[PDB]
Nucleic acid binder design. Structure first.
Ligand SMILES: [Mg+2]
Ligand SMILES: [Mg+2]
Ligand SMILES: [Zn+2]
Lengths: 87, 129, 155, 184, 150, 81
RNA sequence: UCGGUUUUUCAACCGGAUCUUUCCUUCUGGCUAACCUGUACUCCUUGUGGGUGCAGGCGAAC
């Protein structure tokens, strides 16, 4: 990771799934990045500006990916009461 | 028979983590268990945990951030003799940089580093990384 | 132990070199010699006031308590004036990092100054060899009454 | 007669309280005979945020049942008289420390005299007309315990705006952080 | 998960949170105590008494209202039996089985069951001796058992 | 699934769950004020009887025992305590 | 400062004394170190900077 002379070693720092906090590996051909665009007035959807969510393959495989995504959305306010904390 | 409660708790936590859950429901709850949890919290392996009062044994709800990759009790609480801690560390922990061996000393329940600092040893409990 | 009579066998049993001058009559009539064993232990009133004899008593006899002082639970009272003490301990087997439960019976001498039942915990002091197996002499009996105060359940 | 309903009587607040109690005897049948067999083991006033100052009125323990039977009306009266302030009837309880492995065995410590039990009792006393349902204990990431006490959907109107005050009192007493809640 | 069968059930009473007397219940603890004493005099076991209290009267649990468990109360008054209730019941059961066996001999299942019962009794006896509720020498046999029962 | 508030769940869900298996154990049974059609007396009958509970003054039998919840004697009228 | 060495701004870390409803085994005495003192009040910058000094008495200093 960190060398004694301050400077970084570590060839690349990996992405962690925004739902589990678990690391996504390099040959994780199942994992995903969802880009949800920043909206404006009159809708219009601001070009080249978005909220990104990484999902590990594992969650997707399991099935509780959609739910996780929903949860993520309803903490950045992209959805308004779809997911409830108390189930 | 529920021979060990702490062990059960730890196993439950592990199960929760592996399946990706963000919260556990530990069911018998003790002093020792609480202490163990606190150590983890201090080291940042766990979020906020809370103790429900049943008026009988207890029940703990634990929030998991996702950083904790294994708990684990080492069961027959072996009497570890200061110079012996190192061997245990070598065995149980995945590296020499991080991870903690939790051991109950007369100075209280702590991780091995803390014990070393304080210069105390006792019976082993578990490990976290 | 003794159990009654005192002057009960073929020879007259007296404390050696203790003289009770049968001319000028004393209060006790017969003089009783005793000593405190030391080590913080107390000579019981049963020993001072009693009429029993014993050479092998640590209070009223000739033996001296020195060396090791052990403790353990009483297993057998059956043989006269002596006792058997069980002494449970843990033997550490290093290969398996664990402990064996172990045993060792210590035969010990019981001064008639004591009431000893099977199961009482007893403090025993080392002395001069007394018989083939006995090296130890009972100093303190810890189980005093058990539940001799309130034995019956009725309030 | 003031100094006779006090166990031992120094201070001025205590005297005032006694006087108030005496005055309250002029309600007659509901607030006499039952009020006549009552005393204090001193009174401590605790500063609460906002300007209010709560009144921890310490009480023997065999007397407590009687107090409970009487309490609410009496408390209200006190409040009316001693304006702005809240009056809390806590029982004076012993607490005996843990017999340290070195110390002398002073005969078995009763489990009512254990600290936790005492604390629980105090808590019970504090919210009197409202019973306690669930208890939660939040252990925070920072490293400090916050207790969470759940109460009935009934009785609440007796307890109203006193909750902060109660919390403050608790803090003063033990040094533990409390949060009160009403689930429905 | 059960002590002599393969059974794994979890059926049990679930005691409520509040130790305090229920808000709707009036009466008095003294009254309850008196009632309990009366019941004892009449000739009932603790459990039965408790059941009665639960049903005919407003008593949820005796410890909730009085401050004490029923057995304790009985003891205090001097009414708790020579043999603890459960043990007595077990003994009675055993005796019945024995009687049955005496009558018909080829009942092997019954015999097997009897053994289990005996074992249970022994366990209970051991427990009691340790706690010193029974006199520390009390043993269970056949004729003696019958006598105890009757 | 994955993320839940385990501490305060939905009431309906709790109700659905078995007694004991709830967050804190609590009885599903309750007590009843039983009015017998004849005399003006109120008896407090537990909903899961076992015993054939009669009025304290007159023998009438208010409840008969069943597997779980006890059955009331038709002429009787109850009110939940 | 003559590659080493002293404090402060600061830290985490390991202790110690306490006070919190808290005794830490308790006295029968030896030494009571000390001032809780105040007996004459002042060697003295306008002072509570400082100490020759002994009847009541803190004992942890053994
Ligand atoms: Mg089971
Ligand atoms: Mg078995
Ligand atoms: Zn009728």
């Amino acid at each position: 990771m960190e060398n004694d002379k301050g400077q970084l070693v570590e060839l690349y720092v990996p992405r962690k799934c925004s739902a589990t906090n678990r690391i996504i590996k390099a040959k994780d051909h199942s994992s995903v990045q969802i880009n949800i665009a920043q909206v404006d007035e009159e809708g219009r959807a601001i070009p080249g500006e978005y909220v990104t969510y990484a999902l590990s393959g594992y969650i997707r495989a399991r099935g509780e990916a959609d739910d996780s995504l929903n949860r993520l959305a309803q903490q950045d306010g992209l959805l308004k009461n779809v997911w409830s904390y108390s189930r | 028979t529920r021979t060990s409660v702490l062990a059960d708790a730890l196993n439950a936590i592990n199960n929760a983590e592996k399946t990706g859950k963000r919260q556990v429901l530990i069911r018998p709850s003790s002093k020792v268990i609480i202490k163990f949890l606190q150590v983890m919290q201090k080291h940042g392996y766990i979020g906020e945990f809370e103790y429900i009062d049943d008026h009988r044994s207890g029940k703990i709800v634990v929030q998991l951030n996702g950083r904790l990759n294994k708990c684990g009790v080492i069961s027959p609480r072996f009497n570890v003799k200061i110079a012996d801690v190192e061997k245990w560390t070598a065995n149980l922990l995945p590296a020499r940089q991080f991870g903690y061996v939790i051991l109950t000393t007369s100075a209280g329940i702590m991780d091995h580093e803390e014990a070393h600092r304080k210069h105390v040893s006792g019976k082993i409990l578990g490990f976290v990384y | 132990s003794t159990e009654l009579t005192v002057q009960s066998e073929r020879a007259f049993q007296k404390q050696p070199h203790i003289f009770t001058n049968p001319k000028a009559k004393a209060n006790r009539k017969t003089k009783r010699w005793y000593k405190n064993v030391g080590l913080g232990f107390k000579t019981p009133k049963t020993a001072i006031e009693g009429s029993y004899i014993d050479k092998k008593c640590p209070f009223t006899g000739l033996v001296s308590i020195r060396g090791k002082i052990l403790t353990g639970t009483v297993v057998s009272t059956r043989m006269h004036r002596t006792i058997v003490i069980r002494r449970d301990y843990l033997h550490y087997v290093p290969k398996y990092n664990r402990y064996e439960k172990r045993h060792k019976n210590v035969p010990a001498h019981v001064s008639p100054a004591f009431r000893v039942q099977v199961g009482d915990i007893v403090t025993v002091g080392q002395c001069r060899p007394i018989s083939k197996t006995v090296r130890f002499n009972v100093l303190k009996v810890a189980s005093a009454t058990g539940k001799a105060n309130k034995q019956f359940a009725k309030f | 007669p003031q100094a006779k309903i006090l166990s031992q009587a120094p201070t001025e607040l205590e005297l005032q309280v006694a006087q108030a109690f005496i005055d309250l005897e002029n309600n007659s049948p509901e607030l006499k005979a039952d009020l006549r067999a009552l005393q204090f083991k001193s009174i401590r006033e605790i500063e609460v945020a906002g300007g209010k100052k709560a009144l921890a009125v310490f009480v023997p323990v065999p007397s407590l049942a009687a107090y409970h039977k009487v309490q609410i009306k009496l408390t209200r009266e006190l409040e009316k008289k001693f304006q702005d302030r809240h009056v809390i009837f806590l029982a004076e309880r012993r607490i005996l420390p843990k017999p340290s492995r070195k110390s002398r065995q002073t005969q078995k410590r009763p489990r009512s005299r254990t600290l936790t039990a005492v604390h629980d009792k105090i808590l019970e006393d504090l919210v009197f007309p409202t019973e306690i349902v669930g208890k939660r204990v939040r252990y925070l990431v920072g490293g400090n315990k916050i207790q969470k006490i759940l109460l009935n959907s009934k009785d609440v109107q007796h307890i109203d705006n006193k909750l902060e005050s109660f919390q403050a009192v608790y803090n003063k007493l033990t040094g533990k952080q409390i949060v009160f809640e009403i689930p429905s | 998960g059960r002590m002599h069968s393969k059974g794994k059930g979890m059926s049990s009473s679930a005691i409520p949170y509040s130790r305090n007397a229920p808000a709707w219940f009036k009466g008095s603890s003294d009254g309850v105590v008196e009632q309990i004493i009366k019941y004892a005099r009449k000739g009932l076991t603790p459990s039965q008494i408790g059941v009665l209290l639960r049903d005919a009267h407003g008593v949820t649990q005796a410890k909730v209202i009085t401050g004490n468990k029923i057995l304790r109360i009985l003891k205090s008054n001097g009414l708790a039996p020579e043999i603890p209730e459960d043990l007595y019941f077990l003994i009675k059961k055993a005796v019945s089985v024995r009687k049955h066996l005496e009558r018909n001999r080829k009942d092997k299942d019954a015999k097997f069951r009897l053994i289990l019962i005996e074992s249970r009794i022994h366990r209970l006896a051991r427990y009691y001796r340790t706690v010193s509720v029974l006199p520390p020498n009390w043993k269970y046999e056949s004729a003696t058992a019958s006598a105890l029962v009757n | 699934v994955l993320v839940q508030d385990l501490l305060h769940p939905t009431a309906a869900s709790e109700a659905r769950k078995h007694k004991l298996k709830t967050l804190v154990q609590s009885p599903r049974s309750h007590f009843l004020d039983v009015k017998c059609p004849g005399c003006l007396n109120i008896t407090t009958v537990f909903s899961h009887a076992q015993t054939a509970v009669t009025c304290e003054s007159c023998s009438t039998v208010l409840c008969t025992p069943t597997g779980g919840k006890a059955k009331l004697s038709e002429g009787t009228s109850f009110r939940r305590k």
